[PDB]
Design a protein around this ligand. Structure first.
Ligand code: SF4
Ligand code: SF4
Ligand code: FES
Ligand code: FES
Lengths: 633, 633
């Protein structure tokens, strides 16, 4: 099973699924092989009813689409639609939060409130919304209105791009026409320009894609901002991860999907319902996280992470998962079928994301606590039904220190330099104790043995003194393999990095180091890494494409990960992707995305499926950036 | 060549392309066969990087997507993205016009103006914008602002849906949650919900698709409204169609694409530049239309239609097409390559729609006349270069009476009943002289011999006394085969229909009938058919799904045609589609779209590739509607 996942708890559950005859994602992948090479290379188009069109990567006809679309057009159009789809998910998430903040401060959703007033005011200030003399609710109404306004054209560009990157970067982007006019505007324009008989120039299409990726960045940054306002900015927390966080004698409830609007209320209403659960024979309600909504409540509340991404069905296979509470994105719809075998109650909550066979409980922010109670009573009923059934929870977990929002990182560094917190970090980049920074982001992918690329790359970079930060299921992968346990710093980190993590942790009174990898949150909280990197660029007076900072979507899957990778390139980062995106069928598109975009944004994709080679390539990119700053490497 | 096209001028040009070795769309289709059956049936998904996933229509594995997406989910998700893409094109078009109207009345685009003040005021009144005491420019600014506001969420739903359908229809739609909240909002929500791990219930997905199709209807209706304001509401015109409208001794300029913002200025600036063209040796500039922008200037100015859709390359093969001026949508990008052989100057004008190898001349509304002159001088230069070259313009054209906006139809009928213009039409539906109404819409498709389905179906319906109206390339097909020439009424029309077309034409002083088919304009001007049908529903006090009105996208191609077909169903019409959409891989999705949606919206798709059978099925749908009104049939 280690060919499927490197996570030992997942391996144990794959053995249980196998002997119980429960089909998993890996089994459905095997059943799909060999996969279509036209689709794998990007040389397939179904954009009109004259299709499907495909183009042989090599050989004879077909060489061109029926309408005359070339390989480079077809590849670029498909990629652009992926970016637009990713942007549509993160900005649906962000819009959900904007509407929740608005309802809350309009007195329409009393379960929600301004928790982080300081962040509310800083965001207002960043957007140019006056705060002096204003009620918090009015400031928040104006921030929510500004959030919603960024979805459409108006007399300013998308402010969750132009106000979150340094002016020099905005200028570069504007010079190439890449600043988004409106988040949903760009999504629609991508769908328009990529429809039949429209844009048919690869560079033009890909410039549109870069712009739409910044609409995705805006949605991510907006979602982090709004979720921090509503639910609190993360600070360092200690918890655990992997399936051993499930407890046979508790009602185990996973929150799964993405939006803390749902997850965060499940967490505190579950505390309220402890005696109800104890009346049912349980010790209490054990909320555990799956996927980004699990990252959200891990970061803010220390809720333990059960699993992530590709292995999400395995939590159900334990037999102890009483409920899986879903909102949207990245939920394998297989879970509704597996629930029939495992007894888990799968509950959908959002009208635009239902799964046949799952129970749907409309969640309305206006009724959040009551809706959460209904949902949790289904979970308790389910717990009662498995009274006396054996379960198989692997007794496998790791310790996870997390909660490293950018604010938390700055605060930690401020213990070393109170009025110039970034300087101790930059000092150690300059003296070589920190070689550079790498952000691990994005998914697992069934094509890659789960977590192998993240851990292989992260080990090599940590030994080379790279400061590693992670989000989403990259953070999930690293947490489940111990990379967020400070007890593993000696093993994992180069001496320079160890010295820095120790100096920071000791100054923060830990009696020990920060963990080897800093968990910066969910995938929208990639925006926190942008905030940190933009702050470093501003502090250094250079653009982001001069910083020794890279990104790696080492096991990417979702359209959202494609969008994040593309905005990472657009804001100036060398960006590794560890799975093949459907671009190999066009050399001109590949050359743009891996080479000539350097002349446009300074960032570039590094496509590399072999993780040791990817680590080398990421180190070379970091070291090239070091050299260009005149630093030793 | 008649297996490729039933148009004799196209056949002649296919012979010329063949002996000159110029590859055409039909040759690229042949090179694509056999096409992928997974894509053809809809059983392919590339929504994440674990894909491509496919499902065998029948047999053994693969049976399910890697994430657990079933066939019905995958089919419904792909269809929904097609609808969203269609909506994105029509609403990009409509947004373009809204921005042009705004610039014009802000003094920023002097080449544009309020031409149809009456329509401006009626639209304002329909939207609830006060006109009394207001300057036209202010009313128009408010209409443009309302147009732009319909793209995003706000405190009203999309008014270019709710104000253009009768209240009883809006109520039905609202009861099912189908009224769009914002045009680009719905497009993005479709892209979100159809991304991996999101919506996975076919009925839920398809309800989202119906709603997004109404966002497409809104974009169409908005585009017609705004184009009528800016360029004038069509009234009956007489012109010609097919390749014989090209003139060897003139500078032949085709306008191609969709937006009259461009086409309409090409038309009047070309009149200005007659002596310039005559100085170059030409008799003048002969502007001819291709595709919907050609329909727009045909409807408003009687510009002759050269060709449409699938045969658009054939205009270039004549050797006489000096320029092809493009904005966006439905332009085969092959034209840029063919231009190298034919000498035609292909000129793109919109930043989001470029074609490698074409000359790009930025068109800015603010500089429209100057930009048009630059474009037309390229055309004259090209004419000069073919001094002495033989050309082969087939001497084949038809007479086309067109310009039947809904206003024009009502006005025509008012000659028979001044204060109740719809009543003479309804009287003849009741007495059986008009059996029902059929709207032909949408594209040609290389899979169907060009125009064969439109003409075969239209002949059968006309003999059965159906009032036939047409838009887009369905109007193009029928015009190029004589169905818009009143000289063919005796041949084509049943006695009852003939009696009605004659009575109306004689009352309009024609000394003869209206033509056999009424051309209601471009594809956004399908909205004119909605206006007519909604007016009939209102006049009769019944919803649209009780009217003997059907639609046929007999040779559909574009995602836009899928969106139009879907909103035709959503507003209550039996809607034929004459090509296979990628739904056959899921019986549950097919059953929803062809049967159980009747219980939701009263409309339904009729998938039928055989046009004689399609005509029978459309007549049965009309006659069922007649029976349900208690009428003989
Ligand atoms: S858009 Fe062009 S390449 Fe794509 S399916 Fe249609 S004809 Fe084929
Ligand atoms: S979304 Fe599901 S069905 Fe589609 S490519 Fe990804 S794993 Fe396959
Ligand atoms: S031919 Fe397989 S993805 Fe289209
Ligand atoms: S397998 Fe051919 S369209 Fe995907």
């Amino acid at each position: 099973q280690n060919l499927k996942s490197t996570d030992r708890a997942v391996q144990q559950m794959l053995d249980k699924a196998k002997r119980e005859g429960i089909q998993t994602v890996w089994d459905r992948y095997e059943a799909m092989k060999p996969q279509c090479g036209f689709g794998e290379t990007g040389l397939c188009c179904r954009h009109c009813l004259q299709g499907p069109c495909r183009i042989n990567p090599f050989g004879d006809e077909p060489k061109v689409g029926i309408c005359g679309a070339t390989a480079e057009v077809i590849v670029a159009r498909g990629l652009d639609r992926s970016i637009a789809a990713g942007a549509a998910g993160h900005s649906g998430h962000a819009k959900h939060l904007a509407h929740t903040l608005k309802k809350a401060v309009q007195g329409k959703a009393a379960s929600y409130m301004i928790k982080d007033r300081t962040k509310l005011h800083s965001i207002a200030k960043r957007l140019g919304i006056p705060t002096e003399g204003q009620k918090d609710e009015d400031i928040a109404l104006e921030v929510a209105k500004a959030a919603l306004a960024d979805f459409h054209e108006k007399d300013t560009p998308v402010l969750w791009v132009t106000t979150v990157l340094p002016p020099s970067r905005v200028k570069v982007l504007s010079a190439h026409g890449l600043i988004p006019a409106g988040i949903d505007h760009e999504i629609a324009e991508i769908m328009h320009r990529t429809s039949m008989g429209c844009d048919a120039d690869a560079q033009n299409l890909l410039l549109g894609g870069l712009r739409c990726s910044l609409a995705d960045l805006a949605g991510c940054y907006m979602g982090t901002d709004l979720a921090d306002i509503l639910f609190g900015t993360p600070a360092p927390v200690v918890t655990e991860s992997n399936l051993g966080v499930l407890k046979a004698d508790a009602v185990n409830v996973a929150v799964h999907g993405h939006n803390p609007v749902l997850s965060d209320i499940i967490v505190s209403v579950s505390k309220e319902m402890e005696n109800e659960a104890r009346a049912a024979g349980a010790t209490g309600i054990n909320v555990v996280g799956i996927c980004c909504t699990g990252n959200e409540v891990l970061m803010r509340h220390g809720i333990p992470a059960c699993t992530h991404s590709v292995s999400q069905e395995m939590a159900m296979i334990t037999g102890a998962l009483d409920a899986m509470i879903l909102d949207y994105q990245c939920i394998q719809p297989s879970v509704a079928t597996i629930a029939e075998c495992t007894g888990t109650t799968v509950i959908t909550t959002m009208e635009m994301s239902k799964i046949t066979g799952a129970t749907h409980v409309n969640f309305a922010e206006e009724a959040a606590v009551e809706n959460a109670k209904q949902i949790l009573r289904l979970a308790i009923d389910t717990f009662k039904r498995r009274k006396g059934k054996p379960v198989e929870i692997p007794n496998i977990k790791t310790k996870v220190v997390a909660g490293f929002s950018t604010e938390a990182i700055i605060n930690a560094l401020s213990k070393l330099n109170a009025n110039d917190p970034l300087k101790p970090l930059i000092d150690n980049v300059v003296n070589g104790n920190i070689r550079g920074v790498c952000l691990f982001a994005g998914c697992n992918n069934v094509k890659v043995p789960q977590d192998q690329n993240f851990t292989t790359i992260a080990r090599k970079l940590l030994k080379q003194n790279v400061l590693v930060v992670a989000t989403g299921c990259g953070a999930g992968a690293l947490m489940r393999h111990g990379f967020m346990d400070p007890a593993n710093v000696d093993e994992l980190c180069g001496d320079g990095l160890k010295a820095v993590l120790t100096a920071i942790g000791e100054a923060n009174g830990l009696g020990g180091p920060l963990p080897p990898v800093l968990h910066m949150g969910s995938c929208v909280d990639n925006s926190r890494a942008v905030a940190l990197v933009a702050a470093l660029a501003n502090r250094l007076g250079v653009d982001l494409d001069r910083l020794p900072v890279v990104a790696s979507a080492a096991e990417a899957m979702h359209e959202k990960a494609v969008a994040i990778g593309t905005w990472a390139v657009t804001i100036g980062l060398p960006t590794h992707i560890g799975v093949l995106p459907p671009i190999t069928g066009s050399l001109p598109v590949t050359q743009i995305l891996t080479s000539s975009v350097k002349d446009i944004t300074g960032g570039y994709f590094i496509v590399e499926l072999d993780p040791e080679t990817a680590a080398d390539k990421l180190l070379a990119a970091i070291n090239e950036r070091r050299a260009g700053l005149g630093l030793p490497w």
